[PDB]
Scaffold this active site. Structure first.
Site, mmCIF file in Angstrom:
data_model
loop_
_atom_site.group_PDB
_atom_site.id
_atom_site.type_symbol
_atom_site.label_atom_id
_atom_site.label_comp_id
_atom_site.label_asym_id
_atom_site.label_seq_id
_atom_site.Cartn_x
_atom_site.Cartn_y
_atom_site.Cartn_z
ATOM 1 N N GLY A 1 36.303 58.752 3.626
ATOM 2 C CA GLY A 1 35.034 58.563 2.948
ATOM 3 C C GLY A 1 33.882 59.325 3.578
ATOM 4 O O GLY A 1 34.019 59.951 4.624
ATOM 5 N N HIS A 2 32.728 59.248 2.929
ATOM 6 C CA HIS A 2 31.563 60.017 3.325
ATOM 7 C C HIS A 2 30.337 59.319 2.749
ATOM 8 O O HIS A 2 30.408 58.609 1.747
ATOM 9 C CB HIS A 2 31.707 61.469 2.829
ATOM 10 C CG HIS A 2 30.632 62.393 3.301
ATOM 11 N ND1 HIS A 2 30.371 62.629 4.634
ATOM 12 C CD2 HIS A 2 29.749 63.139 2.600
ATOM 13 C CE1 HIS A 2 29.373 63.492 4.726
ATOM 14 N NE2 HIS A 2 28.971 63.806 3.504
ATOM 15 N N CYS B 1 28.016 60.974 9.297
ATOM 16 C CA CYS B 1 27.382 61.130 8.003
ATOM 17 C C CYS B 1 26.414 59.999 7.695
ATOM 18 O O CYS B 1 25.420 60.216 7.007
ATOM 19 C CB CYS B 1 28.429 61.203 6.890
ATOM 20 S SG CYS B 1 29.469 59.749 6.690
ATOM 21 N N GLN C 1 24.980 67.324 11.232
ATOM 22 C CA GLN C 1 25.602 66.424 12.202
ATOM 23 C C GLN C 1 25.842 67.038 13.568
ATOM 24 O O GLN C 1 26.222 66.321 14.489
ATOM 25 C CB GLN C 1 26.947 65.911 11.674
ATOM 26 C CG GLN C 1 26.884 64.983 10.462
ATOM 27 C CD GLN C 1 28.205 64.283 10.268
ATOM 28 O OE1 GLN C 1 28.792 63.791 11.233
ATOM 29 N NE2 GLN C 1 28.709 64.281 9.035
ATOM 30 N N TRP D 1 24.541 66.310 0.947
ATOM 31 C CA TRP D 1 25.730 65.814 1.627
ATOM 32 C C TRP D 1 25.540 65.637 3.117
ATOM 33 O O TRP D 1 26.417 65.108 3.774
ATOM 34 C CB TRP D 1 26.925 66.751 1.409
ATOM 35 C CG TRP D 1 27.316 66.929 -0.035
ATOM 36 C CD1 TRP D 1 27.075 68.026 -0.805
ATOM 37 C CD2 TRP D 1 27.983 65.983 -0.883
ATOM 38 N NE1 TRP D 1 27.543 67.832 -2.069
ATOM 39 C CE2 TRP D 1 28.112 66.591 -2.150
ATOM 40 C CE3 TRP D 1 28.470 64.685 -0.705
ATOM 41 C CZ2 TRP D 1 28.702 65.946 -3.223
ATOM 42 C CZ3 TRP D 1 29.072 64.057 -1.774
ATOM 43 C CH2 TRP D 1 29.186 64.685 -3.014
ATOM 44 N N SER E 1 31.251 55.168 10.276
ATOM 45 C CA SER E 1 30.601 53.865 10.270
ATOM 46 C C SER E 1 30.933 53.138 8.977
ATOM 47 O O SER E 1 31.207 53.765 7.964
ATOM 48 C CB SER E 1 29.080 54.047 10.394
ATOM 49 O OG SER E 1 28.347 52.874 10.086
#
Length: 254
Positions: A194-195, A47, A17, A212, A137
């Site tokens: 969250g992810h 992410c 990222q 990840w 997002s």
């Protein structure tokens, strides 16, 4: 559960990222009260963007973007002066998948770095990214739409929600994607954040291989009810992404 070796690893695909993935995200303008300054830094790609971009690289698709996207940042975002509109001219894009490399470790050309940064920025904009030191997002619902409408992926692309399936039928859908050599976009929510990430393999133990989106940090095998990476990357919250899970499946070109 069939054994499937990591699809992204098989192609050397490892995105993150930060630099040089975020060279075209918005440059942070303001300090959030109570937080150290990130002014002058590019925002994280998010992410959701990193996960989606890794899957797009797996397919090297599309060569041509289809439709532009525009949105306005929430005025609650403390990192930018408002109003702030973002625009991605995706309909004009000739994505060069020879320049968008599977991974970056520094010695790549500026053209190559800008190619991945452009994809990251375009994808993030298409999912209404809330840009910051971490970038968030809504994820799945926007990813499935963007892949089809902006990026020309197959109508097979769709979101599935964990709550709509038994464990067996949920895992069977993931297995089916992997059997078709189709990495899966996946997300979940933990206690304090969250992810989103990619499921791209399985070990036959009812564990799945996870990428990840942190450049390799914590990638490995996890049960879908224990998505609990130890080391956390940008936007990692407190890990444990076990609630409100959803996925985007059917990801393949037209």
């Amino acid at each position: 559960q069939p054994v499937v070796k990591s699809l992204l690893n098989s192609k050397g695909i490892h995105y993150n990222q930060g630099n040089p993935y975020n060279l075209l995200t918005p440059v942070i303008e303001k300090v959030k009260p109570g937080e150290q300054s990130f002014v002058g830094q590019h925002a994280a790609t998010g992410c959701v963007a990193t996960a989606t971009a890794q899957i797009m690289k797996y397919h090297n698709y599309p060569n041509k973007g289809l439709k532009d996207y525009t949105y306005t940042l929430s005025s609650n975002n403390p990192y930018f002066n408002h109003p702030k509109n973002l625009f991605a001219a995706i309909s004009t894009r000739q994505y060069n998948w020879n320049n968008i490399l599977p991974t970056y470790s520094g010695r790549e050309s500026n053209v190559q770095k800008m190619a991945i940064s452009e994809l990251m920025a375009d994808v993030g904009i298409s999912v209404d990214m809330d840009y910051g030191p971490s970038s968030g997002s809504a994820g799945s619902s926007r990813v499935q739409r963007a892949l089809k409408e902006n990026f020309g992926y197959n109508q097979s692309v769709h979101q599935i929600n964990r709550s709509d399936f038994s464990k067996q039928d949920w895992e069977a859908q993931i297995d089916k994607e992997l059997s078709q050599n189709q990495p899966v976009y996946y997300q979940g929510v933990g206690k304090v954040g969250g992810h989103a990430f990619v499921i791209d393999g399985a070990d036959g133990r009812n564990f799945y291989h996870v990428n990840w989106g942190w450049g390799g940090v914590s990638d490995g095998f996890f049960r879908l009810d224990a998505l609990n990476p130890s080391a956390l990357g940008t936007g990692g919250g407190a890990g444990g992404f076990n609630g409100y899970q959803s996925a985007v499946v059917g990801i393949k070109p037209l």
